[PDB]
Amino acid sequence: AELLLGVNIDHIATLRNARGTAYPDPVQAAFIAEQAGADGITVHLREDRRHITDRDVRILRQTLDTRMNLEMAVTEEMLAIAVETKPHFCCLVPEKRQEVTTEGGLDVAGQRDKMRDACKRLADAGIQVSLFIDADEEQIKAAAEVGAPFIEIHTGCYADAKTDAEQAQELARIAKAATFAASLGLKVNAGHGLTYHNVKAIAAIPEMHELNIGHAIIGRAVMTGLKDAVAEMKRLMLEARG
Amino acid sequence: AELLLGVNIDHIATLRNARGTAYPDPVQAAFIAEQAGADGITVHLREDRRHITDRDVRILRQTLDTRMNLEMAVTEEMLAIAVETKPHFCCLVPEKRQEVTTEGGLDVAGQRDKMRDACKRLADAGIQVSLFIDADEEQIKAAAEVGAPFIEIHTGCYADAKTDAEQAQELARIAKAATFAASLGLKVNAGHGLTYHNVKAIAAIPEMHELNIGHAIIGRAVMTGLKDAVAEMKRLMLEARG
Amino acid sequence: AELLLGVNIDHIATLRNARGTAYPDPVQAAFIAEQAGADGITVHLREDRRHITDRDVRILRQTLDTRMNLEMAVTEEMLAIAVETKPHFCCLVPEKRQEVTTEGGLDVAGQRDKMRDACKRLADAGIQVSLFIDADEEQIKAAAEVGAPFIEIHTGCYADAKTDAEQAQELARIAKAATFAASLGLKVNAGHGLTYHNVKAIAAIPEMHELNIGHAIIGRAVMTGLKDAVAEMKRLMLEARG
Amino acid sequence: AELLLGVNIDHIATLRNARGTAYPDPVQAAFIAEQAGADGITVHLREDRRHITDRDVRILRQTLDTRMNLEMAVTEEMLAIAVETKPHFCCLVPEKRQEVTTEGGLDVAGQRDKMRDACKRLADAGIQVSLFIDADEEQIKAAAEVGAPFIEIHTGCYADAKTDAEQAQELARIAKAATFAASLGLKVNAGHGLTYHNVKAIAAIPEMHELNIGHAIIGRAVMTGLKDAVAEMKRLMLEARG
Amino acid sequence: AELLLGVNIDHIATLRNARGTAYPDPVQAAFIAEQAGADGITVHLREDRRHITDRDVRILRQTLDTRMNLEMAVTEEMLAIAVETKPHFCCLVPEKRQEVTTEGGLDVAGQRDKMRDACKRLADAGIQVSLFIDADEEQIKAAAEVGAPFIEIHTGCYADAKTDAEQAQELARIAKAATFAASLGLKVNAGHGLTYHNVKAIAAIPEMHELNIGHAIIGRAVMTGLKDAVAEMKRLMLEARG
Amino acid sequence: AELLLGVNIDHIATLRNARGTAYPDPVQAAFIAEQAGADGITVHLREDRRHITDRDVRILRQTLDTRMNLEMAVTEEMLAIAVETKPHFCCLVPEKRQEVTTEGGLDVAGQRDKMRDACKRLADAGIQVSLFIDADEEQIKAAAEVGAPFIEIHTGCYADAKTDAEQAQELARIAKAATFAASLGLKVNAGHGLTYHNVKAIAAIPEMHELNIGHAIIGRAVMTGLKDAVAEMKRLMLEARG
Amino acid sequence: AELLLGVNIDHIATLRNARGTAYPDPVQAAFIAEQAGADGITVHLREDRRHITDRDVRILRQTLDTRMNLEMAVTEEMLAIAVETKPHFCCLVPEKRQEVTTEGGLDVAGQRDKMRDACKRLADAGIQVSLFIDADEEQIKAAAEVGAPFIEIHTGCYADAKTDAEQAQELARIAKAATFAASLGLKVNAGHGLTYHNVKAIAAIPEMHELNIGHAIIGRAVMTGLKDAVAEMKRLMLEARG
Amino acid sequence: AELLLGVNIDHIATLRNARGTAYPDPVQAAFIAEQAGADGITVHLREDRRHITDRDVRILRQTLDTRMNLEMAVTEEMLAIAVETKPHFCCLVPEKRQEVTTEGGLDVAGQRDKMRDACKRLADAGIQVSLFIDADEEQIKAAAEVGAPFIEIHTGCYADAKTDAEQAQELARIAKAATFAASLGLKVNAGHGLTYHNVKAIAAIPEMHELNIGHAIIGRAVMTGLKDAVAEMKRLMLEARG
Ligand SMILES: CC(=O)[C@@H](O)[C@H](O)COP(=O)(O)O
Ligand SMILES: CC(=O)[C@@H](O)[C@H](O)COP(=O)(O)O
Ligand SMILES: O=P(O)(O)OC[C@H](O)CO
Ligand SMILES: O=P(O)(O)OC[C@H](O)CO
Ligand SMILES: O=P(O)(O)OC[C@H](O)CO
Ligand SMILES: O=P(O)(O)OC[C@H](O)CO
Ligand SMILES: O=P(O)(O)OC[C@H](O)CO
Ligand SMILES: O=P(O)(O)OC[C@H](O)CO
Ligand SMILES: O=P(O)(O)OC[C@H](O)CO
Ligand SMILES: O=P(O)(O)OC[C@H](O)CO
């Protein structure tokens, strides 16, 4: 069916938090996005609450007209929050307290029991889990074995390719990994580093269910405003599939 | 004459730097702003290059169609940069390496010789100096004594007033300080924390020459886009004087 | 000095409640307005929770960037809710469960004790109280005697005049009542029934502090969108003072 | 040819009637919709004239540039009005005087004679009849037998689905029902509860002739303006079919 | 009192009647105009019904949110229609069945009895009457003597001026004539031939109450759309008064 | 080959000529149209010069960026004008001095010699000739026999259809007639009476080369502006072909 | 009355001529400017037809809705063209065949007879003459003596000011010159080098009748579009006078 | 697969250089385009630095977000500049100092040695080389033999065709040349003379990788603004492939 767009509004809070003011408010960015092409909203509640905060999640949970996709690290604090919050989607990601952003898929194959616990735990609460991982068969077989219904392939390496050949190489690895994951019964998403200029190649991949894009959109938004930024990204996505 | 607007684009870089990507690029934000009501562009080259970087200043110096107002801490590194860069305006501000943002006027009365050196030094290079200070007579007499041709009153306390009375109190102190400074031959600017809802009271103050606003504009921009954000702030300013 | 605009978003909620869906959400309408010329947001908590709900007030209170003006009846339930909510402003209004929409002004001259307590009570909680009253000297004197900081003159009869002469009649009545109110040291607002075609005459009255407008704005909004609706109204208001 | 959009403007009037003012006028909204993607305009003349009025239907009938689709209960009052008004389309729904909105499908199977004479009478007047019903084979077979050329499948349950699973089930139920209705020679529409986020899966169903949508469009319009609200909906609809 | 704008939509019907179609419909044009700066809608029912028809007048009378200004010739047909329609305003003009447009200027001084009975009759029906005349003090004194509360100075000669000097002369003529009219207690309007480039000089005349403009606006409209055309005219009008 | 759009700006002049002014100028309308989706500009020089004049034709011939399609009657006057103007295209139509608009359909089969000499003459001047005819295979066979490279099926009956059935019948008629025409080597255009709501069915006909639309577009234009009106039509046309 | 804006569209043509294509057409730009704040259109027919052509002047003369202001050198070629073209205004400038742009003012004082006969000849043709000169009392006195009704002060040096001090000096020089010219009965315009950032101080000068601006407006238009470019300039101009 | 758009901003600079001011600045034009549908920016460094300057290339290289396509002559100066600049793409073009704008295609078949070296040289520097050539098999074979990755077919003759037949002639010639080029393993682009009215036929050619367009876009831009100019072109291109 229709490829979907998950808009990550973390960086609205990044701008807010830089100053300690109330604006810009993620809650406003969520309404705009949801009416301009976003099929869902994503927020990464970082342990260090760098950008998205507890009030953000709490108020958003009440105001989203679509659904929340809560991104989080695998810890007891977070699992308890997710269970209490009951987001529709949950994407487990690797975290370091002071990293710039995310860059290593989640190491599922290496923490199989931790993840297995997380997946069972969140599902019991009625949350659909997605594991943020690398276009790596080892990590994918592990996500499947562990029970997760969704995986989201890290498109970072593709987005940072330094040459056209290097980019084609990564693209191919993502497409193969997508087909591979699907053959194991997993639904697959993608995201991170996706921009207005490299999104179509990823959107074209058939197995892709939803693309989670954040930074590039907010980066376009300061110039053109969120509404147009979201609608334009969505248009590019639908074009890639037609 | 006409009240002027200095748009601070630091937070365009804040968003860029959060990810290490090239966008959003301050250079684009500068063209947009300069064509939507900004009479000048301001950038704060922080020692820790948190947001605005050396390439930013170097490229902006070549692309600004109006003029640069370089905000900086008083150090030999910065003075050498300013002298080499030759910005049209220079605003000396107090810096701590890891502060959220600025909150203490510059302590001129306490470093009279340092400032006296800075002012003479920059002026020799053909730079018009402004000292970012508090609506404090002691600091103002000091700025005058030291030679600076401009001062910029810190409107932070006013912007963070917690009650209507507390706000009226601060407003009054800023207006009195503005009149006081002018009586000593200083031209006076204002800025920091200025928003769409508290700018008119400051713009109304006759002695005000230019208002330097940043965060609130970028904060509005993510929603409506820079162009409208800048034009709207400028309109509110001109309305306050008519 | 500068005439302020208070936008009442009640009817965003009537549209929502007509169905029991979540949209259109008052919370979104607030951000749009505050960014299009509104200086404060107004919401009337009806006894029958006809439109604005407790939920709305609870979230609005945390999402507004300007300040809340809570219109309500003088009942123990509401006073308790107001004291608890701590809105910046509170406007006391007459209210019948099955009324179409506020009949006229509060009877202050006839319930000096009840009102005296309501005021003091709210004032103790840090709320600036406005008594919605008719352009009647007896009521104004009463309001002043009771200790309210503000009054809001009812513009309903003016908006309902069936002839140019009847309208002019009401106009002068409001204009005199306003000068009178001010002479007793009361700040004075006005509202109810103001439209894009009759606001300027009211806006031109010097003594007016803030105009509270809702229905006509939402009515323009379903055609043009809330943003231009709010901006147009504000524009018209400022021209009248010009 | 292409999927048609019937825009129900009932809620423009609920906004009007909430106050008794003349605005917003349904007549205006009609021109905007017809020029923004509406192929027809829909109005439900309720027993209690809650929103649309005899006045509205009387003027719309003379101003609509496309065609009127009159929704109404099967009562002598409505049939008489229908026969006299001669709208292009008439949609027969079940109605309780004080319901929030239409609840379910018309009970056709269990009221064959009532409906058989209703369709016949309206047809003698040259009106094309559509019976609003549940995605129910029994109700569908009956609709055909009583001679109606159109049926409109209630999409309400699909819209209210509490879980993705429930939703997919309702979807399948509607698609199967639509195929069955068509096999019987019926032309089929769908509507009630359709939004910007659930409209595509319904539009994708091949048998669908025209979709009738109201509340969701009006709820978007208060933010966005009716023009864009309608165009965005028509856009999503054609995309779904492409 | 702000200068008012009366928008004549006759030429919307000129376009419609040129083909026999039902569009463009003057009824839609009226809603757009009243919401873009028009304080009133003007229509000239012509004997030959070349543009505005009885239908238009009958529907507009029910859809106008502001008020109707019916332009007509002084004949039995028209007077009976006006009394039955009961427009807020009515402007009597010279009419010749085969004319391009109004030649300009009622001969009031040469027909005091006819014009006296017309005004009385229209005023008995509660219609404020405007006598369309030339910038001639004889016609003006006559207008006052016959009982009309309004007159509208014909701006056609000013508009068709062939030299800067002739224009200046007509401008000075309209101005002095307007001051004279006001001294007689007459409210003075103006119109016919006004354009985006010659309206300011007329708007600057203090005594002017309302300007009635039509063709120029419709001619701008086919290019830029009715909304911006009305708005632009009103904007130039208000600027001239400041 | 994409379906092309020929925009007839006759009615821009209808509005101009109604007053004698110089605006709105067909010349400006042509630039807007050619840049908003029009692949060619069409003008019908009428014997009574009711709208387009010799001036228009003479200036348009020098300002058109695409190409002119001159609609005219088959008379000596016109043929001489066309040969002198040398329009890229020329469409011959039935003409009666006092007609509302083109009645529809050249009698080619009843005047083979006249039409044969006309085509030759225009083709000698290098003008590609289009014979405006009815969806009649006799007229079509004749058109081919006389030597015309183009014909334009008259869509007026389809447009004025009074019932869904009559419309369908005319649609099927235009379609089969177009297939027949193409089999004779004729390029087939269509136009007259097409609107935003009936253009798709005609655009979907594969054999169609260019559609010539005028009035509907000008009627939309007075409301929304020429640009969006042309664009909207072209958009619906291309969607129909997909 | 109000400050007038003459928009010079020469550089629309430099873009055209750089390629020999027909676009962009000056004729189109003229309609856009005249409807966006231009009170007149200016063209400089250069000796080398670098941008504007005889063709342009010939068509503009027939399409301009306002008036043409022909800029040209004082040569037999240009005077003859001027006399024949009959533009409303003619501005006499100094010109070298291969200059980048006009360098300074016309040498009037030192060529009295040449200019005296030029003004006389153009005046016999009914053209209003303006002599482009430096803010020079000698050149100004001479301009008056040779009979020119207008002078246009070169704002070039003010525009090129290398320092704020230099700029203020030039400003003062122009304002004083303007006052002097007026005392001599001359009407005075100004232009060349005016931008969005230096236009206000010039517009503020009371004696200024019309400002002629070109390059700056066209430079903004390639980014922004001509419409907004012209409207923004007219906006800044009226603000300066208010 | 997905046709790419390369926007040539040369003529932004011609407009700038016509005066020697800093605006319009190519650097601003780049950001706008890259964000409106351009996939890469093209600039031609002329020997005479007619428009694009070394400054432009130096900054552009650091500000572009997509990638540079440097068009240049095959000279030691340019090769040195290219190797030093390291543009993503480089297109070799024939160039005469006083030419109006690139005459035709490079002569590769006649200078196989020179080109062989240029290619290898640039390739060693990491640049993908495109040989701008005529749709001539001899040249294509040559280009393939020499080792260039790409060729860019000259669309000038196609754009200049004076008859529909001549245009069609050129079309097929380009289409065959493209299939031919591809069969030799060459990637193929096209450009020069493409406009909004002739791009689709070229865009529809399967083998096309990227179309490089400049002048027509800047020409549309002075009217509508660069953003809509770029977007429109891209939109048209994508529809042709659709
Ligand atoms: C894993 C990923 O792709 C991102 O969603 C990451 O959570 C973004 O973090 P920031 O928003 O802090 O950049
Ligand atoms: C002193 C002041 O008002 C600001 O300009 C300060 O330099 C802003 O720093 P940030 O931009 O990092 O918030
Ligand atoms: O790199 P971003 O900003 O595209 O963020 C990605 C989404 O949240 C996916 O995890
Ligand atoms: O607080 P801001 O963001 O308004 O920043 C202020 C200006 O640079 C003034 O120093
Ligand atoms: O009449 P309304 O709808 O403008 O309501 C006004 C606000 O509640 C202020 O009283
Ligand atoms: O649910 P609604 O309000 O969208 O409207 C339903 C349509 O009129 C269909 O009957
Ligand atoms: O000359 P018009 O077309 O502008 O309109 C005239 C007004 O209606 C005056 O009555
Ligand atoms: O019927 P119209 O006004 O749309 O225009 C007809 C076209 O010009 C066909 O020739
Ligand atoms: O400097 P310019 O290009 O703005 O134009 C000058 C005006 O035409 C005045 O002469
Ligand atoms: O003809 P242009 O102006 O489209 O120029 C095209 C680019 O340089 C590509 O060759």
mmCIF file of N, CA and C and ligand atoms in Angstrom, chain C residues 6-8 10-11 42-44 69 71 91 93 101-102 132 152 155 190-195 211-217, chain D residues 19 23, ligand 5:
data_model
loop_
_atom_site.group_PDB
_atom_site.id
_atom_site.type_symbol
_atom_site.label_atom_id
_atom_site.label_comp_id
_atom_site.label_asym_id
_atom_site.label_seq_id
_atom_site.Cartn_x
_atom_site.Cartn_y
_atom_site.Cartn_z
ATOM 1 N N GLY C 6 -7.671 39.807 22.214
ATOM 2 C CA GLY C 6 -7.813 38.549 22.927
ATOM 3 C C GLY C 6 -8.711 37.674 22.060
ATOM 4 N N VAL C 7 -8.198 36.548 21.571
ATOM 5 C CA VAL C 7 -9.008 35.673 20.724
ATOM 6 C C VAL C 7 -9.675 34.543 21.505
ATOM 7 N N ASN C 8 -10.991 34.457 21.377
ATOM 8 C CA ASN C 8 -11.740 33.412 22.054
ATOM 9 C C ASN C 8 -11.864 32.224 21.103
ATOM 10 N N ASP C 10 -13.407 29.358 21.768
ATOM 11 C CA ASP C 10 -14.512 28.488 22.146
ATOM 12 C C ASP C 10 -15.092 27.715 20.962
ATOM 13 N N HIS C 11 -15.441 28.442 19.910
ATOM 14 C CA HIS C 11 -16.090 27.805 18.772
ATOM 15 C C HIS C 11 -15.298 26.867 17.891
ATOM 16 N N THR C 42 -8.522 33.436 24.934
ATOM 17 C CA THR C 42 -9.674 33.385 25.816
ATOM 18 C C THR C 42 -10.450 32.098 25.591
ATOM 19 N N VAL C 43 -10.926 31.508 26.680
ATOM 20 C CA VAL C 43 -11.743 30.312 26.600
ATOM 21 C C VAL C 43 -12.759 30.402 27.721
ATOM 22 N N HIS C 44 -13.997 30.075 27.389
ATOM 23 C CA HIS C 44 -15.070 30.119 28.365
ATOM 24 C C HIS C 44 -15.442 28.684 28.757
ATOM 25 N N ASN C 69 -7.203 33.820 29.494
ATOM 26 C CA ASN C 69 -8.254 34.674 30.004
ATOM 27 C C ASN C 69 -9.425 33.712 30.128
ATOM 28 N N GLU C 71 -13.012 32.833 31.002
ATOM 29 C CA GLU C 71 -14.339 33.391 31.201
ATOM 30 C C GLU C 71 -15.137 32.290 31.890
ATOM 31 N N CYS C 91 -12.420 36.341 33.593
ATOM 32 C CA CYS C 91 -13.534 37.258 33.337
ATOM 33 C C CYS C 91 -14.842 36.618 33.832
ATOM 34 N N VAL C 93 -18.731 36.089 34.162
ATOM 35 C CA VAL C 93 -19.858 36.262 33.256
ATOM 36 C C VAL C 93 -21.190 35.649 33.743
ATOM 37 N N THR C 101 -25.783 32.115 24.248
ATOM 38 C CA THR C 101 -24.460 32.721 24.459
ATOM 39 C C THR C 101 -24.429 34.029 25.270
ATOM 40 N N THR C 102 -24.206 33.945 26.576
ATOM 41 C CA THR C 102 -24.130 35.147 27.416
ATOM 42 C C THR C 102 -25.135 36.236 27.021
ATOM 43 N N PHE C 132 -17.411 41.276 33.479
ATOM 44 C CA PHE C 132 -18.095 41.518 32.217
ATOM 45 C C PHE C 132 -19.394 42.223 32.566
ATOM 46 N N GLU C 152 -15.222 44.468 31.464
ATOM 47 C CA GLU C 152 -15.226 44.261 30.029
ATOM 48 C C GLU C 152 -16.594 44.730 29.629
ATOM 49 N N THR C 155 -20.431 44.539 24.231
ATOM 50 C CA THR C 155 -20.676 45.207 22.956
ATOM 51 C C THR C 155 -21.821 44.548 22.181
ATOM 52 N N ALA C 190 -13.630 45.244 26.140
ATOM 53 C CA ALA C 190 -14.937 45.193 25.502
ATOM 54 C C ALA C 190 -14.992 43.953 24.619
ATOM 55 N N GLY C 191 -16.191 43.454 24.376
ATOM 56 C CA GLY C 191 -16.297 42.283 23.532
ATOM 57 C C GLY C 191 -17.692 41.708 23.474
ATOM 58 N N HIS C 192 -17.851 40.755 22.567
ATOM 59 C CA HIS C 192 -19.094 40.048 22.321
ATOM 60 C C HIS C 192 -19.847 40.706 21.184
ATOM 61 N N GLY C 193 -19.886 40.004 20.052
ATOM 62 C CA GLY C 193 -20.565 40.516 18.878
ATOM 63 C C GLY C 193 -19.721 41.382 17.953
ATOM 64 N N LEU C 194 -18.450 41.586 18.275
ATOM 65 C CA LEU C 194 -17.598 42.402 17.411
ATOM 66 C C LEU C 194 -17.269 41.630 16.143
ATOM 67 N N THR C 195 -17.362 42.294 15.004
ATOM 68 C CA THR C 195 -17.069 41.632 13.743
ATOM 69 C C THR C 195 -16.070 42.446 12.942
ATOM 70 N N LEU C 211 -9.584 43.927 23.379
ATOM 71 C CA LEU C 211 -10.881 43.562 22.838
ATOM 72 C C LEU C 211 -10.865 42.052 22.772
ATOM 73 N N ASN C 212 -11.955 41.434 23.206
ATOM 74 C CA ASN C 212 -12.057 39.986 23.194
ATOM 75 C C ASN C 212 -13.085 39.622 22.116
ATOM 76 N N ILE C 213 -12.610 38.878 21.118
ATOM 77 C CA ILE C 213 -13.402 38.493 19.962
ATOM 78 C C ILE C 213 -13.265 37.009 19.636
ATOM 79 N N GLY C 214 -14.375 36.344 19.342
ATOM 80 C CA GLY C 214 -14.287 34.927 19.046
ATOM 81 C C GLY C 214 -15.077 34.457 17.846
ATOM 82 N N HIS C 215 -16.384 34.327 18.025
ATOM 83 C CA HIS C 215 -17.245 33.830 16.968
ATOM 84 C C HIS C 215 -17.046 34.397 15.566
ATOM 85 N N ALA C 216 -16.960 35.713 15.431
ATOM 86 C CA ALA C 216 -16.770 36.299 14.104
ATOM 87 C C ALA C 216 -15.441 35.835 13.493
ATOM 88 N N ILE C 217 -14.430 35.655 14.343
ATOM 89 C CA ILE C 217 -13.122 35.218 13.879
ATOM 90 C C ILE C 217 -13.132 33.765 13.412
ATOM 91 N N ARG D 19 -24.733 30.575 17.004
ATOM 92 C CA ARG D 19 -24.906 31.955 17.403
ATOM 93 C C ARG D 19 -26.139 32.662 16.850
ATOM 94 N N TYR D 23 -23.449 34.482 9.375
ATOM 95 C CA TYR D 23 -22.175 33.861 8.990
ATOM 96 C C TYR D 23 -21.734 32.768 9.967
HETATM 97 O O1 LIG I 5 -18.844 37.484 20.632
HETATM 98 P P1 LIG I 5 -17.562 36.755 20.643
HETATM 99 O O2 LIG I 5 -17.832 35.564 20.091
HETATM 100 O O3 LIG I 5 -16.674 37.758 19.913
HETATM 101 O O4 LIG I 5 -17.013 36.387 22.014
HETATM 102 C C1 LIG I 5 -16.109 37.304 22.622
HETATM 103 C C2 LIG I 5 -15.208 36.779 23.767
HETATM 104 O O5 LIG I 5 -15.662 35.718 24.626
HETATM 105 C C3 LIG I 5 -15.091 37.996 24.642
HETATM 106 O O6 LIG I 5 -16.096 38.167 25.382
#
